[PDB]
Scaffold this active site. Structure first.
Site, PDB file in Angstrom:
ATOM      1  N   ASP A  57      64.366   9.680  29.269  1.00 57.93           N
ATOM      2  CA  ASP A  57      63.686   8.486  28.944  1.00 57.93           C
ATOM      3  C   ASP A  57      64.929   7.382  29.274  1.00 57.93           C
ATOM      4  O   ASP A  57      66.031   7.536  29.029  1.00 57.93           O
ATOM      5  CB  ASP A  57      63.347   8.257  27.476  1.00 57.93           C
ATOM      6  CG  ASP A  57      62.789   7.045  26.867  1.00 57.93           C
ATOM      7  OD1 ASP A  57      63.125   5.929  27.192  1.00 57.93           O
ATOM      8  OD2 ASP A  57      61.465   7.068  26.384  1.00 57.93           O
ATOM      9  N   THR A  90      60.757   1.118  30.453  1.00 62.23           N
ATOM     10  CA  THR A  90      62.186   0.767  30.177  1.00 62.23           C
ATOM     11  C   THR A  90      63.087   1.103  31.151  1.00 62.23           C
ATOM     12  O   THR A  90      64.278   0.874  31.182  1.00 62.23           O
ATOM     13  CB  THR A  90      62.706   1.305  29.060  1.00 62.23           C
ATOM     14  OG1 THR A  90      62.579   2.785  28.965  1.00 62.23           O
ATOM     15  CG2 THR A  90      61.701   0.995  27.647  1.00 62.23           C
ATOM     16  N   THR A  91      62.467   1.860  32.327  1.00 61.20           N
ATOM     17  CA  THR A  91      63.499   2.263  33.345  1.00 61.20           C
ATOM     18  C   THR A  91      63.195   0.961  34.460  1.00 61.20           C
ATOM     19  O   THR A  91      64.081   0.674  35.270  1.00 61.20           O
ATOM     20  CB  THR A  91      63.097   3.642  33.966  1.00 61.20           C
ATOM     21  OG1 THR A  91      63.469   4.478  32.985  1.00 61.20           O
ATOM     22  CG2 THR A  91      64.143   3.917  35.185  1.00 61.20           C
ATOM     23  N   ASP A 391      55.104   8.153  23.675  1.00 65.46           N
ATOM     24  CA  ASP A 391      54.864   7.551  24.766  1.00 65.46           C
ATOM     25  C   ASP A 391      53.360   7.663  24.940  1.00 65.46           C
ATOM     26  O   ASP A 391      52.459   6.709  25.330  1.00 65.46           O
ATOM     27  CB  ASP A 391      55.498   8.135  26.151  1.00 65.46           C
ATOM     28  CG  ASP A 391      56.956   7.265  26.214  1.00 65.46           C
ATOM     29  OD1 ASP A 391      57.093   7.039  25.228  1.00 65.46           O
ATOM     30  OD2 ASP A 391      57.471   7.319  27.324  1.00 65.46           O
TER      31      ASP A 391
END
Ligand SMILES: Nc1ncnc2c1ncn2[C@@H]1O[C@H](COP(=O)(O)OP(=O)(O)O)[C@@H](O)[C@H]1O
Ligand SMILES: Nc1ncnc2c1ncn2[C@@H]1O[C@H](COP(=O)(O)OP(=O)(O)O)[C@@H](O)[C@H]1O
Ligand SMILES: [Mg+2]
Ligand SMILES: [Mg+2]
Ligand SMILES: [Mg+2]
Lengths: 528, 529, 40, 98
Positions: A57, A90-91, A391
Site C-alpha cells: 500500500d 494513494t500511489t 480497500d
C-alpha cells in the site's frame, strides 16, 4: 538578511528552494513507483522493536519509511487526506505530483517564471474535469458490476486465489447491510481475526462473533434456539454515592446486615429469572444475556442454576449491532421488562482457541449487520488481509454511492492527454507550455504500468496512442501481452470520485509548491 | 583522497541508522543465506539418532533438549527471514503438535534450490507458480499412500504400539516403557462421544530414583500439607469452597459499636458460638474433608479438629477447578451446609511422602475417572523436563489419531515416493515451470539424507537403493537404523508409521513460508533500539 | 583439543586455595601465635 | 554479513572438542571431593563472601558451597543432591563413579 539577526538560522533562497523541492519529490516517486499495478513488488518493513510488516500500500509505505523532510511531510499529509475520504489511490497521487513537478522544472530551467505554468495548470485542470465528466459510464449497479469493481480493487493487494475469495465476502456483506435509501453505514461490519487455518478460510458470517465467552464452568456451551436479551444495566456490587458505614452490635446483627446488603442486585436477577421462566416454560428453548457491564460470581451462579448463558462487558458498539441483527431492544433498566424487548437467534455456540474464547451468534432472520472472519497462520498475513478488506469495502461503497463507474488500465489518462493537446492552440501567451506540461504528467500512469510488466515505455505508449486516434475506443494497456485493449469489455473498472479528487489534490499541491520563494528555519530549535 | 558523497534523492532523505536493501543481489540471496544457516543450526537433531543440544538463555537458565520448537524458542534470532521460518514452525507446533523440524528442513531445501533456479535464469514468479503446482499435486497424491488405519483407540495394546514411533525419536532406548505409561494415562480419560481434551493429563515431577520408577495415578497429587490434625480418610465425602474458611463480613466498612458493658462481655462468646454452629452444621451432612481456596481461621481450624474434619487449602484458582472436575464436586461461594448433589466422592485421601517431598493424594479405585496424573522420577531436573516434553508429544499424537485415523509409512518411504511421482508428473509438463517442479521433488530427498547423516552411514547409497527398490513397486520401504552398513527395510511390517495430518500440514506450511520469503523484493529497516 | 582456560567456579580468577601439609602447617602457626599472646 | 543471524555475543562450540572439555571439567568436580572418602578421610573448610566459614566432610554440602557455573559440571551436583534426597548416605561415591 535573517542571518544577521539569527546566526543559527538555516535558509534556502530563490533558486535553491525549487531545487530542494523537486529533488525530494523525485526521490519519493522513485521509491513509490514500484507498487503500481497487479505486477508490483512487495515491501518488508521492520521497526526498532523487531516486528515485521509485509505491504504494498502507498499510504502504509509512506508512513513506515524512515524519512525527515518538510515537503515529504506535505506529500504524506496529502496522501493521508486522500486515503481517509476515498480509501484508494494513494500511489498515483504521489506519482502524478512528482511528474508534474519534474515537467514544470523542465521549462522553468530555461528562464520561464512559474506563474505562467501555474495558469496553464489551472486551464488544463478545468478541461480535464470537463472531459472526465463525459467519459463516465452509468449503470444499474447490479451484483456482477460490483463483483468486477471489487475484484479490480482487490487484485492489486493479494494474489488471485485469495482475491477470488475476498471479493464474494465483501460484495455480499455490502449488499446485505444496504437499504434502498439511508446511505451505506459501515461500522455495521465487524472485522474479527483468528490465527489458524490458512487464509483461504476467510469467511462471511450472517451473525456476530464476540471475543469473549461464558465465565461459569456450568453454563451450556451450545444453544439451539435462543432468546437474546441485550442490556447495559450493572449486576455488580454497588455502593452509595454518599459516604456510609455499617455499625452493628454483635455477630447476629453482622450476619443480618451481610445478607441485607445484596437485595438491590438480587431483585434484578430475580426479574431476569422470572421473565425467562415466563417465556421459556418448558426446557426446550434457550436464553442468552449479553451485558455491557460487569457480573459478579454470585449473579453468575444464580443465573447458571437456571440454565442461562451470560456474557459480561461487551463492547459499546455491539449494543447497536445485535439490535440490528437479532432484532430486539437494548435497554438500560429492568422496571419495564417485557417479551417485546427480546430478540431471536437460531444458533449460539462457543469456540476455544488456545487461551482465548469466541462466541458465535448465527441464523438470524434478516440481519442488517454481518461479520467478516479473517483467518491465517501469521500476524502480518492478517494485517495485510485487513488492509485489502478495507480497500475493497470502500471501493464497493463508492461505486454504489455514485451512479457511474470509469474504465481503467490507463485509458482515461490517454484520452485526457489527447483531448488536452488539441485545446492548447486556443489559449494565448506562454501558458500553452504549462498546458503541455500537464498533458505529459497525465501519461505517468500508463508508462509505469508497462514498465512494471517488462515492456518498453515509449514504443508501447506509441502503440496505445496509435489507437484512440483512428478508432476512438477507450484503450488501455494489457499487462500480459503489451497490446492495446478495450478496458470496459475486459472488466477493469475505476471509481469516478477517486479520479476527481486525485486531479484536484495533485493540481492544488503542485501549484502551491511551485510558488515557494525561500525555506526558513529561524525559530526556536526546540520547544524548551 | 576523495570521497563518493551520496546519491541524490532517497539516499539523502533517509534517517541515520536505518538501512535499505534492494534488488536480487542485496535482498533475495542474503535472505536465502540466512535461512540456510538457520536450517543447518537444527539439522543435526533429526531422527532417533539425533544428538541432544544444550542452550543457556539470557536469564542463565539451562535447557537440554532435542525438540526443534523449544530450541528455536530459546534462541535469540535477529534476521527477519529466519523469524518467518520460526513463526511457521511455531504455527505447525500449535496446529498439530509434532513435526516442527520437517518444516525447517523442507523450507531450507526449497530456498536453497530456488537460489540456483534464479541463478540459471528463471524469474521469481515462475519459481513461485511451479512451487504451487507441485504442492497441489503432492496434496492430491498423498491420500493414496495411506496404510493401516487405526482400528480401536480404547485398546491398550494397540494404543501402546501406535504411540511408540512418536517417542522413539525423542527417548531412543526407553520408548516401550514411556509408550505404555502414556497409553494407560490416555485410555483412562477418553470419554464416550468425546472430544479428547489435552488439559486433563497432569504431570508431577519428584526428584528421586531412576526413570523406570515412574507411575500413573487415577486422581490428583498436590505438593502441600494438611492444615489440621486428621491425616487420612478411607471413604471421602468432599465439600469444596472458593471462599475463606472464616466468618464472613460486610463489603462496606463495618465497625462493632458497643454502648454498655454487657455487650462488651457477650460479643466474643457470640462470635464463638456462631462459628461452632456453622462448623457443626457443615459436619452433620457427612463431609469428612473440606477443601478451600482462601485463608483458614484459627477458631475454624479448632472446631474442624474437634469434629474430625480433614482440612486442605490450595491457592491457584485453577487447581481448584481441576479438583472439582476430578471428584465431581461443585464449588460454593458461601459457607453453608452443602446439598447432596454438590458432594464430591473419593475412594482415598491421604498424606504421603516420596523422596523427601510431602504430598496429598486424592485417589480413585475407578479405572476411567475424569482426569489422571503421571508421576515422574529422575536424578536431574533437565532429564525430567525432557521426559515431560516427550509425554506431551505422545499425548498430542493420541489427540491427532482421535481426529483422524489414517497412517502413512515413515523413515523416508513417503518422501521418496512423493519425489518419484512428482518427478514423473513434471516430466510431462511443457514449459518453463517444469524445472521448478522437478526441484520441488528433489527437495523431498533432504529428509532421508539427514536421517542417514545422523546414523553414521553414506546417504548416497541409501537414496540410490531406496530409488531402486521403489522402482519395483514396494511403497513401504525405508531406511534401516539398526544395521551398520546401509540397508533398507519394510516399514509397515516393522510398525514405523506417522500421521497423515501431520505430513499434510507440514508440507502446506513449509511451502507457504518458502513462497512468502521469496516474494519480498526490498527491505527497509529502522535502527535497533 | 586445546584445553584452553575454561570456567568452572564463579570468580575463579580471584579465589585462592591451600592443599596438603602446607595448609595444615599454616593452621599450626596461627594457633601458636594466639597461645604465645596469652602465655604471659 | 550485513545482517547476522543471532544476536552479537552468542558463543557456540560443537564437535569432539566440546565433549572432551566437558569430560575434563567433570574430573575437576570429582577431584574437589576426592579425598573425603573412607575411615581415613579429611574434611574441607569453605569461606563465603560475607566471611562466615563452614567445615564439612559431607560431599553434597561441599558441592553446594562451590559456585559451579559449568553446564556440564552442574550435573554432578544435581545427582549428589538427588542421592542426598533419596537415601541420605553415599553422596561422594556417586560422584567418583560418574
Ligand atoms: N488487470 C489490470 N490491468 C490493467 N491495469 C490494472 C489492472 N488492475 C488494476 N490496474 C490499474 O492499477 C491502478 C491502481 O494500482 P494500485 O496498485 O491499486 O494503486 P492505487 O490504486 O493506490 O493507485 C489503476 O489505475 C488501474 O487502472
Ligand atoms: N525406528 C525408526 N527408524 C527410522 N526412522 C524413524 C524411526 N522412528 C522415527 N523415525 C523418523 O523420525 C522422523 C522424525 O523425527 P523427529 O526428530 O521427531 O522429527 P520431527 O520433530 O520433525 O517429527 C520421522 O520422519 C520418522 O520417519
Ligand atoms: Mg487500489
Ligand atoms: Mg518429531
Ligand atoms: Mg557416607
Amino acid at each position: 538578511a535573517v542571518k544577521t539577526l539569527n546566526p543559527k538560522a538555516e535558509v534556502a533562497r530563490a533558486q535553491a528552494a525549487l531545487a530542494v523541492n523537486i529533488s525530494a519529490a523525485r526521490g519519493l516517486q522513485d521509491v513509490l513507483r514500484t507498487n503500481l499495478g497487479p505486477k508490483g513488488t512487495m515491501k518488508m518493513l521492520v521497526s526498532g522493536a523487531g516486528d515485521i510488516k509485509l505491504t504494498k500500500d502507498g499510504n502504509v509505505l509512506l508512513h513506515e519509511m524512515q524519512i525527515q523532510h518538510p515537503t515529504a511531510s506535505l506529500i504524506a499529509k496529502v496522501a493521508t487526506a486522500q486515503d481517509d475520504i476515498t480509501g484508494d489511490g494513494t500511489t498515483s497521487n504521489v506519482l502524478i505530483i512528482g511528474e508534474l513537478l519534474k515537467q514544470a522544472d523542465l521549462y522553468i530551467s530555461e528562464g520561464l517564471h512559474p506563474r505562467i505554468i501555474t495558469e496553464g495548470f489551472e486551464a488544463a485542470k478545468e478541461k480535464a474535469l470537463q472531459f472526465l465528466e463525459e467519459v463516465k459510464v452509468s449503470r444499474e449497479m447490479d451484483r456482477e458490476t460490483l463483483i468486477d469493481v471489487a475484484r479490480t480493487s482487490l487484485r492489486t493487494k493479494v494474489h488471485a486465489e485469495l482475491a477470488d475469495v475476498l471479493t464474494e465476502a465483501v460484495v455480499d456483506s455490502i449488499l446485505a447491510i444496504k437499504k434502498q435509501d439511508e446511505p451505506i453505514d459501515l461500522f455495521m461490519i465487524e472485522i474479527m481475526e483468528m490465527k489458524h487455518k490458512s487464509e483461504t478460510d476467510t469467511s462471511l458470517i450472517r451473525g456476530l462473533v464476540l471475543d469473549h465467552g461464558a465465565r461459569h464452568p456450568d453454563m451450556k456451551k451450545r444453544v439451539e434456539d435462543a432468546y437474546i436479551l441485550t442490556c447495559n444495566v450493572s449486576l455488580e456490587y454497588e455502593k452509595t454515592e454518599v459516604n456510609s458505614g455499617f455499625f452493628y452490635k454483635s455477630a447476629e446483627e453482622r450476619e443480618k446486615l451481610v445478607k441485607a446488603e445484596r437485595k438491590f442486585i438480587e431483585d434484578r436477577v430475580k426479574k431476569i429469572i422470572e421473565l425467562k421462566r415466563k417465556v421459556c416454560g418448558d426446557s426446550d428453548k434457550g436464553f442468552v444475556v449479553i451485558n455491557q457491564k460487569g457480573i459478579d460470581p454470585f449473579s453468575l451462579d444464580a443465573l447458571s442454576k437456571e440454565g442461562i448463558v451470560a456474557l459480561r462487558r461487551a463492547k459499546r458498539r455491539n449494543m447497536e449491532r445485535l439490535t440490528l441483527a437479532c432484532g430486539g431492544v437494548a435497554l438500560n433498566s429492568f422496571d419495564d421488562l417485557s417479551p417485546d424487548c427480546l430478540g431471536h437467534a437460531g444458533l449460539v455456540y462457543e469456540y476455544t482457541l488456545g487461551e482465548e474464547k469466541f462466541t458465535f451468534i448465527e441464523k438470524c432472520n434478516n440481519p442488517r449487520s454481518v461479520t467478516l472472519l479473517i483467518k491465517g497462520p501469521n500476524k502480518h498475513t492478517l494485517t495485510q488481509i485487513k488492509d485489502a478488506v478495507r480497500d475493497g469495502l470502500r471501493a464497493v461503497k463508492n461505486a454504489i454511492d455514485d451512479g457511474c463507474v470509469v474504465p481503467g488500465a490507463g485509458a482515461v489518462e490517454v484520452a485526457m492527454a489527447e483531448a488536452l493537446i488539441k485545446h492548447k492552440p486556443s489559449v494565448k501567451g506562454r501558458a500553452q507550455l504549462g498546458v503541455q506540461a500537464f498533458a505529459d504528467a497525465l501519461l505517468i500512469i500508463p508508462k509505469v504500468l508497462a514498465q512494471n510488466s517488462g515492456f518498453d515505455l515509449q514504443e508501447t505508449l506509441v502503440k496505445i496512442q496509435a489507437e484512440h486516434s483512428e478508432s476512438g475506443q477507450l484503450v488501455g494497456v494489457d499487462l500480459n501481452t503489451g497490446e492495446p485493449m478495450v478496458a470496459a469489455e475486459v472488466g477493469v473498472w475505476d471509481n469516478y470520485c477517486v479520479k476527481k479528487q486525485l486531479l484536484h489534490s495533485c493540481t492544488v499541491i503542485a501549484t502551491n509548491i511551485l510558488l515557494v520563494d525561500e525555506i526558513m528555519r529561524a525559530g526556536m530549535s526546540f520547544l524548551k | 583522497a576523495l570521497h563518493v558523497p551520496k546519491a541524490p534523492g532517497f539516499a539523502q532523505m533517509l534517517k541515520e541508522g536505518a538501512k535499505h536493501f534492494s534488488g536480487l543481489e542485496e535482498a533475495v540471496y542474503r535472505n536465502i543465506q540466512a535461512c540456510k544457516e538457520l536450517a543447518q543450526t537444527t539439522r543435526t537433531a533429526y531422527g532417533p539418532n539425533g544428538m541432544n543440544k544444550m542452550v543457556i538463555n539470557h536469564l542463565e537458565k539451562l535447557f537440554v533438549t532435542n525438540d526443534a520448537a523449544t530450541i528455536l524458542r530459546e534462541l535469540e534470532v535477529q534476521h527477519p527471514a529466519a523469524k518467518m521460518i520460526v513463526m511457521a514452525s511455531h504455527m505447525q507446533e500449535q496446529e498439530v503438535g509434532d513435526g516442527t523440524n520437517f518444516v525447517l528442513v523442507f523450507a531450507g531445501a526449497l530456498l536453497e534450490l530456488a537460489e540456483e533456479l534464479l541463478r540459471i535464469g528463471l524469474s521469481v514468479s515462475e519459481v513461485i507458480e511451479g512451487y504451487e503446482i507441485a504442492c497441489r499435486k503432492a496434496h492430491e497424491i498423498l491420500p493414496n499412500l495411506v496404510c493401516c488405519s487405526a482400528k480401536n483407540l480404547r485398546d491398550i495394546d494397540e494404543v501402546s504400539s501406535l504411540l511408540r514411533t512418536s517417542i522413539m525419536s525423542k527417548q531412543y532406548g526407553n520408548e516401550v516403557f514411556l509408550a505404555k505409561l502414556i497409553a494407560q494415562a490416555c485410555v483412562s480419560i477418553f470419554p464416550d462421544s468425546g472430544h479428547f481434551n489435552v488439559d486433563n493429563i497432569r504431570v508431577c515431577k519428584i526428584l528421586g530414583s531412576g526413570i523406570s520408577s515412574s507411575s500413573v495415578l487415577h486422581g490428583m497429587v498436590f505438593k502441600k500439607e494438611t492444615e489440621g490434625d486428621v491425616t487420612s480418610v478411607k471413604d471421602a465425602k468432599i465439600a469444596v469452597y472458593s471462599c475463606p474458611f472464616d466468618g464472613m463480613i460486610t463489603e462496606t466498612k463495618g465497625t462493632v459499636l458497643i454502648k454498655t458493658a454487657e455487650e462488651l462481655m457477650n460479643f466474643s462468646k457470640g462470635e464463638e458460638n456462631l462459628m461452632d454452629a456453622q462448623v457443626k452444621a457443615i459436619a452433620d451432612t457427612g463431609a469428612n474433608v473440606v477443601v478451600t481456596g482462601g485463608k483458614v481461621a484459627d477458631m475454624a481450624l479448632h472446631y474442624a479438629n474437634k469434629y474430625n474434619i480433614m482440612l486442605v487449602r490450595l491457592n491457584s484458582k485453577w487447581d481448584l477447578r481441576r479438583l472439582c472436575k476430578t471428584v465431581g464436586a461443585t464449588a460454593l461461594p458461601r459457607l453453608t451446609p452443602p446439598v447432596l448433589e454438590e458432594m464430591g466422592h473419593c475412594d482415598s485421601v491421604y498424606l504421603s511422602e516420596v523422596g523427601d517431598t510431602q504430598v496429598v493424594v486424592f485417589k480413585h479405585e475407578k479405572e476411567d475417572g475424569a482426569i489422571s496424573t503421571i508421576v515422574l522420577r529422575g536424578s536431574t531436573d533437565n532429564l525430567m523436563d525432557d521426559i515431560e516434553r516427550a509425554v506431551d508429544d505422545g499425548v498430542n499424537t493420541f489427540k491427532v489419531l482421535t481426529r483422524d485415523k489414517r497412517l502413512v509409512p515413515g523413515g523416508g518411504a513417503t518422501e521418496i515416493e512423493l519425489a518419484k511421482q512428482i518427478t514423473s508428473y513434471g516430466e510431462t509438463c511443457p514449459g518453463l515451470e517444469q524445472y521448478a517442479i522437478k526441484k520441488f521433488a528433489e527437495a523431498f530427498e533432504a529428509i532421508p539424507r539427514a536421517l542417514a547423516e545422523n546414523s553414521g552411514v553414506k546417504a548416497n547409497e541409501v537414496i540410490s537403493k531406496l530409488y531402486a527398490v521403489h522402482q519395483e513397486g514396494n511403497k513401504n520401504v525405508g531406511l534401516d537404523i539398526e544395521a551398520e552398513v546401509p540397508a533398507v527395510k519394510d516399514m509397515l511390517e516393522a510398525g514405523i508409521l506417522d500421521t497423515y495430518l501431520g505430513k499434510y500440514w507440514a508440507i502446506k506450511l513449509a511451502t507457504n513460508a518458502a513462497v512468502t520469503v521469496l516474494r519480498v523484493d526490498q527491505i527497509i529497516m529502522a535502527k535497533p533500539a | 583439543e586445546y584445553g584452553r582456560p575454561f570456567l568452572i567456579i564463579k570468580d575463579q580468577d580471584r579465589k585462592s586455595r591451600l592443599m596438603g601439609l602446607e595448609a595444615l602447617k599454616s593452621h599450626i602457626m596461627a594457633a601458636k601465635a594466639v597461645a604465645n599472646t596469652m602465655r604471659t | 554479513t550485513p545482517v547476522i543471524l543471532l544476536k552479537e555475543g552468542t558463543d557456540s562450540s560443537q564437535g569432539i572438542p566440546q565433549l572432551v572439555s566437558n569430560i575434563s571439567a567433570c574430573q575437576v568436580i570429582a577431584e574437589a571431593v576426592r579425598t573425603t572418602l573412607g575411615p581415613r578421610g579429611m574434611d574441607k573448610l569453605i569461606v563465603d563472601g560475607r566471611g562466615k566459614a563452614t567445615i564439612s566432610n559431607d560431599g553434597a554440602t561441599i558441592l553446594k558451597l562451590l559456585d559451579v557455573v559449568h553446564p556440564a559440571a552442574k550435573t554432578l551436583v544435581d545427582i549428589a543432591k538427588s542421592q542426598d534426597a533419596e537415601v541420605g548416605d553415599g553422596t561422594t561415591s556417586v560422584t567418583l563413579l560418574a
